Paper text:
The overall structure of NY107 is similar to other reported HA structures with a globular head containing the RBS and vestigial esterase domain, and a membrane proximal domain with its distinctive, central helical stalk and HA1/HA2 cleavage site.
The Sia-1 remains in the same position as previously analyzed glycan/HA complexes from H1, H2, H3, H5, and H9, whereas the Av-H7 complex structure with Sialyllacto-N-tetraose c (LSTc) did not reveal any density for the Sia-1 in the receptor binding site. The poor electron density map and fewer interactions with protein residues suggest that the cis conformation of α2-6 linkages in 6′SLN trisaccharides show a reduced binding affinity with NY107.
Numbering used by the authors:
A (entry chain A), B (entry chain C), C (entry chain E): 10 to 142, 144 to 158, 158A, 158B, 159 to 220, 229 to 261, 263 to 276, 276A, ...
D (entry chain F): 1 to 171
E (entry chain D): 1 to 172
F (entry chain B): 1 to 175
Amino acid sequence: GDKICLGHHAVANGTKVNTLTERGIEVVNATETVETTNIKKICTQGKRPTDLGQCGLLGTLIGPPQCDQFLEFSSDLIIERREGTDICYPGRFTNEESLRQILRRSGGIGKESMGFTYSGIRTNGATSACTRSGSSFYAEMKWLLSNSDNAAFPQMTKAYRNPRNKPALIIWGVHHSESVSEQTKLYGSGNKLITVRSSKYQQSFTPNPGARRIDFHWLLLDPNDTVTFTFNGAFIAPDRTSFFRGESLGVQSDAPLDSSCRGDCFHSGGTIVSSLPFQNINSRTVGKCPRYVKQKSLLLATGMRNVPE
Amino acid sequence: GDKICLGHHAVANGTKVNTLTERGIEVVNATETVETTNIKKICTQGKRPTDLGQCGLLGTLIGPPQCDQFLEFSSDLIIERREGTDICYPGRFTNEESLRQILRRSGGIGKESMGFTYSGIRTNGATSACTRSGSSFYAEMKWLLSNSDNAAFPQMTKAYRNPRNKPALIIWGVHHSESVSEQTKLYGSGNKLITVRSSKYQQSFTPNPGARRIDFHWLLLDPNDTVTFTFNGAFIAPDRTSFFRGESLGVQSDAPLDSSCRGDCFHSGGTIVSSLPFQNINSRTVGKCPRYVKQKSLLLATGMRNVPE
Amino acid sequence: GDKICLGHHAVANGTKVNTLTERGIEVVNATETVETTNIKKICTQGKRPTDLGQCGLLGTLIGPPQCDQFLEFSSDLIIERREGTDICYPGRFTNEESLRQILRRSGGIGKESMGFTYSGIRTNGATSACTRSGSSFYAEMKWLLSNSDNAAFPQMTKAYRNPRNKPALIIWGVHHSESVSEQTKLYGSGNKLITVRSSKYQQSFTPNPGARRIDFHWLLLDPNDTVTFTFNGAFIAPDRTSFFRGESLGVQSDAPLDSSCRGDCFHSGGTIVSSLPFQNINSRTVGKCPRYVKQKSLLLATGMRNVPE
Amino acid sequence: GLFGAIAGFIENGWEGLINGWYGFRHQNAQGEGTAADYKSTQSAIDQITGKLNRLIGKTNQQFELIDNEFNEIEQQIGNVINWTRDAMTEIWSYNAELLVAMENQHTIDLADSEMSKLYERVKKQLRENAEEDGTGCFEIFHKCDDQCMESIRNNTYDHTQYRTESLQNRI
Amino acid sequence: GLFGAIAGFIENGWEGLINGWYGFRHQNAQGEGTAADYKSTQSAIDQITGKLNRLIGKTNQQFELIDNEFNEIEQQIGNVINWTRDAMTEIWSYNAELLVAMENQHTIDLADSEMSKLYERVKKQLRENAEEDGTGCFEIFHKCDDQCMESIRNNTYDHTQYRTESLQNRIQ
Amino acid sequence: GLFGAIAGFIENGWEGLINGWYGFRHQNAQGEGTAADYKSTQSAIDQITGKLNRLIGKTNQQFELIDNEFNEIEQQIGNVINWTRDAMTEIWSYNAELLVAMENQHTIDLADSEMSKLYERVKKQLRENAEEDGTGCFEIFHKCDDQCMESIRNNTYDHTQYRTESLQNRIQIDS
Ligand SMILES: CC(=O)N[C@H]1[C@H]([C@H](O)[C@H](O)CO)O[C@@](OC[C@H]2O[C@@H](O)[C@H](O)[C@@H](O)[C@H]2O)(C(=O)O)C[C@@H]1O
Ligand SMILES: CC(=O)N[C@H]1[C@H]([C@H](O)[C@H](O)CO)O[C@@](OC[C@H]2O[C@@H](O)[C@H](O)[C@@H](O)[C@H]2O)(C(=O)O)C[C@@H]1O
Ligand SMILES: CC(=O)N[C@H]1[C@H]([C@H](O)[C@H](O)CO)O[C@@](OC[C@H]2O[C@@H](O)[C@H](O)[C@@H](O)[C@H]2O)(C(=O)O)C[C@@H]1O
Ligand SMILES: *[C@@H]1O[C@H](CO)[C@@H](O[C@@H]2O[C@H](CO)[C@@H](O)[C@H](O)[C@H]2NC(C)=O)[C@H](O)[C@H]1NC(C)=O
Ligand SMILES: *[C@@H]1O[C@H](CO)[C@@H](O[C@@H]2O[C@H](CO)[C@@H](O)[C@H](O)[C@H]2NC(C)=O)[C@H](O)[C@H]1NC(C)=O
Ligand SMILES: *[C@@H]1O[C@H](CO)[C@@H](O[C@@H]2O[C@H](CO)[C@@H](O)[C@H](O)[C@H]2NC(C)=O)[C@H](O)[C@H]1NC(C)=O
Ligand SMILES: *[C@@H]1O[C@H](CO)[C@@H](O[C@@H]2O[C@H](CO)[C@@H](O)[C@H](O)[C@H]2NC(C)=O)[C@H](O)[C@H]1NC(C)=O
Ligand SMILES: *[C@@H]1O[C@H](CO)[C@@H](O)[C@H](O)[C@H]1NC(C)=O
Ligand SMILES: *[C@@H]1O[C@H](CO)[C@@H](O)[C@H](O)[C@H]1NC(C)=O
């Protein structure tokens, strides 16, 4: 009595996966779809990185001493550190976050002169917080005041037409003095006003004296369009203006760069390298990343139902 | 030997589709699920359309010459245009997009007279910037100023209580004159304070001369509630108030209206008409639209495997 | 000939369900997957609630008469009410919603004194807008004012270092007088200036006389960090600051509280108690909730296809 | 539908079959007789519970308030919240529909499968002693008394003991 | 196919079956001919029609404008919108890729089961009167004319009539 | 276990079939022997590689930072962002859960199918020359040496060649 049989393979102990109707059912082979192994470095290989070190991202636009070496740069991968600072002298940017969001995808920046020549005022206003080898204030800015103490500052109009291919990033500052008296000493008595106008933008600023500070503001000037500054004091004038290069990623991290691993997905704690559809590492990422899931492990059957002998 | 054989049909020209295991497998017949056919027309049949043209949406509230047509407009589909503007005399509405969004669903507006009367001042303040066969003003507003140059402005109080069953849109304005002398010439000398108070809103305003503007401010006033105004110059008064008619959809487009096609899903580049559950036409749609996808095509099989001999 | 036949159970009581192929096929047994059964109560069992009633949330910081028993509270379920009010005297908070959101997850507040002692000035400025036994003020606040009518208010500094392990919520106020005349009565005459300066926060304030109001402003002061108050009048200073307890969940509702039902999903009109994956009760919920769908019913088969005898 | 047994080659169910899901109905010299089967009935509910254990009693995420009901927030932000929220509703209403519709199809086809699987266990066990109707009955070509019927029911039926007898009846 | 009929034991399809989806091709002393089973074609078409019924003519919910392409909005909110929008597109593109891929799988296998079912019936209908060849044919063992082949398609084949006769042929 | 072969009528798998996925095991006069099946192993593997292509190495979506983790952004917009992110997480954790659980349901049943298909292939090959024992084996009713066993495995077995002997072994009665 001859016979032939039909059957399938099995291993001693397979791996447990979940199906629609059963939990932890053993199969011959399965593979992981959720990446949990993190590379604790910023993988810069192939990219041209910019570790901003002690320079805050926004510093690059106004130019405090910590950013002297980043006033112009080119990068497809910008790495912000926690110890970076945008300022040298009290004050915040308005919209600081969207400006970061814009700079993080700029591909770097390049400065160009606006060519403002000033008549009948003092240009060389300085602070000891900003003083350095180069100049005694923000590198890209000019602190404008009266020819003498308490002297009247003239009503003034300055305009800049963007002569370029792409939109310009225009930064100006408003000076809030330590006191009314101090505001008088730099710009003279009288109520002061700053108005900035392009064909998109229209905004009025009054100094609010009381606690020494310089608050900065910004807009995006259309190519061929003109901006207009009218001011009778407390005005921090741009000397240069930035132009964005190409396309970059912006990472906030405390991990060191490593120029010998290819990275596409980044987060506060390094790099995720994975052709896996999902990741459990970090929910806040930047680049081409696996989707963040809250599960540690999702095993996907690469084999059949394991039935031991 | 007599035989009976069973078997399926096939065609010479099958279609390619994708499954979970196969990609590019061939089926007898398939059906597209992603819409790619666009009508370059805003399909208004059935609707009561409004083509605002030269007139900006917020403009319909104050009444510059461009919006004389639509001071009390009535539609269920509001089409904005790029050339449309909200004002003639320089100045900007505050929290403007919030107001825009409210007006887009409003069903149109019905203007109702607030019943304000003034003596001791002039209410006929017109300007060349807004011409309507000679100098005029916003048709729903009154420019309040002194009887003669440099005459003092009386401390006034005006109250309006909402007699309707639905909220009332209250617009007023703060005129900022050109010079300090300009402001004294049209109103009093000294600090000009405007105070607007309802049972859920309190706000005050100070004019900022130096660059002329009328900046408009609004509040939604509930039925049987009062708005009180207390001012002494620089104030631009409402003549009429607005009430929303019902429901509407707001579209932004450069596409012409067509009253012969019908549709319900709109975007900047026309109308999407489709039973299909997905679309690759435009991601930024308004109305009742098919879900937007990235794929040009996704064919759904409507027939078995094509196995030709 | 003898025979054995095979079959399956059946019923008359069969439920119609939906499959990929047919809408309304009949199965032996089904089971609803969408929850529609609402409890008209806030379920507070196993938790520790705090119904705020007439007391508006932010009222717990400054202490108007409505909020007297809620000055320090311990809670993991904070319930706001439609009737709750934040103020007694006309005035508003800055970034009120932001503050509300951080208060709702605080775990409740604990209050501590700031060690503020004043001399050369009055401390007891009351108003009829807040009544305890007649004229009163905000319980966690001091209205500082000149020693008599028109007396000059002294120039002052007030410092407070956070002694604790967690951050502190410092609230101060600015008083805006009915008129310049009134401001000259309360404090001195002349420019009035307030500066609040922590290591991460600078902001000058000047009072604006015109309509009676008190505006409240705020910061989070870090451990070991000092906040500094320099002022010459119009200053509603804190007597006590506030520290957060742990973790709580904020709710808005009108439903009454019930300590005999358990639940983690709360909304506008009660609580959702369910192990079902979906709910059709309210699109806006808080806590640990099933997902809102728009279907009334999505029936899952729990038996075979039904073919009755 | 997929397997062709339930609402396929088998006419209908039995409203009288209360003892279980799937079962046998024998006819012979000693009257009728219906009796359920365990393994295949049990197996099917083991699966249906599995589906339920994956849906019922999930741990949901916590979500704080982002709106304010009593003090209307800035319409710009609210309308963004309202968009997102409604967009989320669309994604879930879809999932719910498609999950329930998808799981249901699988339930229908799995239950038809347990019928077939059992039907084939029997077909094999009888070898050449019985043929097939095509209506789900096996015409047995020998005398199988009520105590023989039960051997078939729980896999102890020895076909060799009835083979010689059966074969001549098929001629 | 999960059932192993279409692109399985059945070599190929028939480029001349216009009548329907599945058919009967008989060979006898009378000559060759081809028919088509209505019941199994119709059973398969409704399951495809039902698939399109759930996906076509879906009522969608209304959505209003949240941004502004003429006068651009505050870039904080703006970017949040864009960021959300981008994720929404990714979810739907994923779901559309999956719905179709998943539905097409079930469609192919559903049509295959239909083939399998029809074969199964004829097998059981023919009883001990015919033997399956393994490529989808049944060798009928009794002489069976055009009227006779009819009774199989028409599903009214009295097997008893031809048993003794076709059995004798099965031994010889 | 839809197709009832694996974890159904086939009692168990063979721990010593490392030559492939689905196999044969003969028992003839010349002893015992195992060989594997290329046609049906490959059919399954290709349909499993297909699934991996679909999920592994798919092009990821572009991601950008909307939060700020160094200097915290305004509270209100921070909560809206946080809320939105957590909805995504819920959505994607749902999808992944289900994607995998479904692909795993299809993998197991697709595998079962190929076993059942091969079994039905062999069943039809042998025709009247063998019987099914209910455990996945065929009781062959004629002498089948190593070459004969080989012909079955590689689908060249000619049933007409052995029919006459087999029938003399199956019908053990007079006609
Ligand atoms: C005049 C000028 O352009 N810059 C001054 C600067 C400004 O007056 C000030 O920043 C305006 O807000 O003040 C600087 O000097 C040193 C001096 O300043 C007092 O105001 C301060 O109380 C002390 O720190 C004192 O040392 C400065 O650098 O900040 C000098 C600079 O020339
Ligand atoms: C008085 C009035 O209602 N409208 C005036 C308008 C306003 O007074 C002004 O916009 C408010 O700031 O000014 C008009 O002005 C003539 C003249 O005014 C000088 O001050 C200015 O320096 C000149 O350039 C010139 O414009 C105007 O230009 O429209 C007249 C209008 O009736
Ligand atoms: C003096 C003081 O600290 N509080 C006053 C209070 C405030 O001065 C005022 O609210 C700030 O704008 O005014 C209070 O009084 C009653 C009385 O006040 C007159 O000024 C007003 O003209 C009258 O109509 C009447 O309301 C108050 O109760 O709020 C008295 C309080 O002592
Ligand atoms: C194959 O499928 C196509 C489309 O999926 C069918 O084309 C439709 O045919 C009808 C006429 O019967 C037309 O009115 C429609 O406009 C077509 N639809 C589309 C979307 O183009 C076609 O009927 C199918 N072919 C066969 C032979 O059935
Ligand atoms: C966003 O949607 C909510 C719905 O939850 C709106 O709030 C409702 O407002 C309508 C009238 O517009 C009332 O019928 C309801 O009573 C309100 N419900 C709640 C829970 O508040 C809200 O108006 C919408 N927001 C914006 C900015 O349009
Ligand atoms: C968010 O995305 C939109 C659309 O991708 C951006 O608007 C486009 O970009 C520029 C303007 O910067 C125009 O040339 C295009 O025509 C715009 N398209 C549309 C459809 O509006 C928008 O700029 C982005 N927002 C931010 C803050 O970057
Ligand atoms: C949004 O969510 C995140 C948490 O995922 C918050 O960010 C962090 O929260 C942790 C709490 O353990 C703290 O260490 C910090 O406050 C935050 N650090 C980092 C690196 O993100 C964030 O605070 C939340 N936003 C709001 C407004 O609550
Ligand atoms: C099983 O799958 C894994 C992928 O995770 C692979 O490394 C392994 O070689 C595969 N095959 C076997 C037989 O283990
Ligand atoms: C069948 O469904 C009903 C209603 O959902 C339920 O009461 C019952 O528990 C289920 N099971 C049985 C065996 O009836």
